[PDB]
Every structure is written in structure tokens, then in C-alpha cells.
């Protein structure tokens, strides 16, 4: 639509709190309109193409004169949910993105399990990571590769995800918009092009170092993934962080079910005691030798509001740091703090403080550096 300038893309994301950020897209001729989840954690573009009780609409191939069948089926399992369907290609646009149309690979989802989310209001997923993790294999070009190859759009995008039961945010395809952040952009390298893999080199909780061998933080990888809710941490790191949070906030008496995300903590509306809870800092590898920077999130990011489970008299929350056995996942808990620039052209990810992050009058999310890391240990997990 129209000029595709950055001002037209600001605020092009919507969602329900806790159910994913999506952008509007059109597929097929004539255009069929669907809300598509923005997922930096995977690389397949896939839309519902069959009735499903959670879907209010879906893509109908037979209606599109520009659809082509690739006669190959496909199966994707994620950490949460799975789906299968048929590969094909079709014309695709983004009404509040660039002003372009691209022929892209589409998976028509015909069966799924625990994938679609009731009331989330989206009907597909946009995998924005690289080919290497696309199913069935890396020869299925992801959408972002197609868009850059076929158009003039610069090889970057950036995301501003805004926390809380409606959320919003922006995907700027092709550049950086100055009104979505304040302060400076700090960049960490993309270690390998598959997931948007990065290296964490130090973790602090309330300024106190977790004091683990830095390889533990990236065992067996660390990714930035807009399709995952939580900050997911490898088991050993999960355990230490909970301990450290529990101590800093004297919540040793909270049930351990709260800490495994099996129960909500509820306070009188307007009284959440933000300040008993510690800020969390990740130091990320810098762009020069032995330099790093940190990102810092508040409890306002790692405690997430949950609605319609209890009286409006009360705010209730879920602990949204959880355990993983497949590496760190810097999910929405992390991304809601910052403006995040996915600078594929220069193999780097940028963080700046988000103009829209939830904070209080005492504390804000921060992005700070440079720090000289006296340690020349290689923090990446290798074997």
C-alpha cells in the first residue's frame, strides 16, 4: 500500500497479550487477507489452508489464479505445536509494509496440533530466520530471502514489540525508524546464519554476577526468537537465576509452582511491588575483540500480566523465565524491552531501549556499553 515509507509501517503489528504479534499480509490473486505471526525463531512461511476451530479464516488455494503447487508435503514441529501441509508458491504482499509483491514459498497447513491459539486472531506464521533451519530442507527459500532477491528492499528488518488485553508494535521492513527507540543502538554479531544466533558473555541479577562459566549461557546455543513467549534458559542457568531472583526479592516463601510457571501470583490492582524484584542484565558479545554491552530488563518484562482468570480488582502474573534443553531463547520477555534490529546485511543484531517498553517512575530497561571483558574465553558452545 501507497509509498511504503517507514511512517506507514509504524504500528503495523497487533496481538492479544500473551498470544503472539502478527502483521497483516495478502496472499493470492485476488488477494486473500490473513493475520500472520511474526516469528524470528523459524524459517517457514505457513498459513492455515483448512478449517480449524481456532481459525476464523484460512487460505483457499483454489481461489487464487496465481497459486502453483510444488507437489511436495512438509512437516514442521516446534518446541510448542506442530503442523503439516502442502508446499506451493503464490503472490504475497504486506499492506502496511513495503509496497511490493513477491512470489514466495507458502506452506498450506492442512493439519495441526497445539499450534493455532484460541483468540490469538492470527492464522499463519512468518519465519524470518535463515534457510538452514527451513523444512523440509534449506533449499526451500524463506520469505525474507525471496523478498530481498525479487525487490530492491534493503536486507534488514527491525522489530518493536510492545507489551501489555491488546498489544501492538512495529515491523519496519528495510530499515530503522528513529521514533521507536531512544539512546544508542548496540550490536552483537550473528554467530551463524540459521537461527538468529548470538553469544551471551555474562549474566547479572541485581548487579550480582551469576558467576558461571560463560559457555553455560549458550549451551548449546542462544537465539533471538520473536515467536517464543519466555526468556528460556538452559537448565543449569535456569536454576541459578531462580535462586538468585528468589534471594534478591525475599520470595523464598512463594510456592515453587510459581517458579515453574504452573501458578500466577496476584496482587491488589495498582500495588504490584515491582521494586522488590531484581533487574536482569545479559552481556552480549560486541563487534570488537573483548568488548561487550549489556541489555537490562525489569520485572515488568519477566512477570507477565494474565487477565480474566481473577477479579479486575487484582493484577495477576506469570513468571515467564523458564527452562530449556535446547539453548537460551531470548523470546518476547527480552524483545518487549528493546527495539531490535536484525541487520542481516552486516551479520549483526542491534539493541536499543524501546520507546514503548513497560517501566515505572523508578527504573527503565537499558542498553549500555562498551565494557571491556578482561576474559578472552570463547563463550560459544562448540562440540
Amino acid at each position: 500500500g501507497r509509498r511504503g515509507s517507514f511512517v506507514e509501517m509504524v504500528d503495523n503489528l497487533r496481538g492479544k497479550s500473551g498470544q503472539g504479534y502478527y502483521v497483516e499480509m495478502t496472499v493470492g490473486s485476488p488477494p486473500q487477507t490473513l493475520n500472520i505471526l511474526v516469528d524470528t525463531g523459524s524459517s517457514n512461511f505457513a498459513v492455515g489452508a483448512a478449517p480449524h476451530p481456532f481459525l476464523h479464516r484460512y487460505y483457499q488455494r483454489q481461489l487464487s489464479s496465481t497459486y502453483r503447487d510444488l507437489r511436495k508435503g512438509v512437516y514442521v514441529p516446534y518446541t510448542q505445536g506442530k503442523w503439516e501441509g502442502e508446499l506451493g508458491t503464490d503472490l504475497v504482499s504486506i499492506p502496511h509494509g513495503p509496497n511490493v509483491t513477491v512470489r514466495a514459498n507458502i506452506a498450506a497447513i492442512t493439519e495441526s496440533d497445539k499450534f493455532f491459539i484460541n483468540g490469538s486472531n492470527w492464522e499463519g506464521i512468518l519465519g524470518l530466520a535463515y534457510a538452514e533451519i527451513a523444512r523440509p530442507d534449506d533449499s526451500l527459500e524463506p520469505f525474507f530471502d525471496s523478498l530481498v532477491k525479487q525487490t530492491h528492499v534493503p536486507n534488514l528488518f527491525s522489530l518493536q514489540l510492545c507489551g501489555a488485553a491488546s498489544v501492538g508494535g512495529s515491523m519496519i521492513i528495510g530499515g530503522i525508524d528513529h521514533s521507536l527507540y531512544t539512546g544508542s543502538l548496540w550490536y552483537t554479531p550473528i554467530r551463524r546464519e540459521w537461527y538468529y544466533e548470538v553469544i551471551i558473555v555474562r549474566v547479572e541479577i541485581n548487579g550480582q554476577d551469576l558467576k558461571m562459566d560463560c559457555k553455560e549461557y549458550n549451551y548449546d546455543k542462544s537465539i533471538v526468537d520473536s515467536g517464543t513467549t519466555n526468556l528460556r534458559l538452559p537448565k543449569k542457568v535456569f536454576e541459578a537465576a531462580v535462586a538468585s531472583i528468589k534471594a534478591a526479592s525475599s520470595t523464598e516463601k512463594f510456592p515453587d509452582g510459581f517458579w515453574l510457571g504452573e501458578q500466577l501470583v496476584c496482587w491488589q490492582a495498582g500495588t504490584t511491588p515491582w521494586n522488590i524484584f531484581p533487574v536482569i542484565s545479559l552481556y552480549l558479545m560486541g563487534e570488537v575483540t573483548n568488548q561487550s554491552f549489556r541489555i537490562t530488563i525489569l520485572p515488568q518484562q519477566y512477570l507477565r500480566p494474565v487477565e480474566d482468570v481473577a477479579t479486575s480488582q487484582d493484577d495477576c502474573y506469570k513468571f515467564a523465565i523458564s527452562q530449556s534443553s535446547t539453548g537460551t531463547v531470548m523470546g518476547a520477555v527480552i524483545m518487549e524491552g528493546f527495539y531490535v534490529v536484525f541487520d542481516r546485511a552486516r551479520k549483526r543484531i542491534g539493541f536499543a531501549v524501546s520507546a514503548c517498553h513497560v517501566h515505572d517512575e523508578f527504573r527503565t530497561a537499558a542498553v549500555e556499553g562498551p565494557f571491556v571483558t578482561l576474559d578472552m574465553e570463547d563463550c560459544g558452545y562448540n562440540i
Binding site: 501458578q263 500466577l264 491488589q268
Partner: peptide, 9 residues
Amino acid sequence: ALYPYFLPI
């Protein structure tokens, strides 16, 4: 009033 309290999910 009793706070905080906990709810299952």
C-alpha cells in the same frame, strides 16, 4: 485483604 495469593493455571 489477603495479598499476594496464588492461582493455578
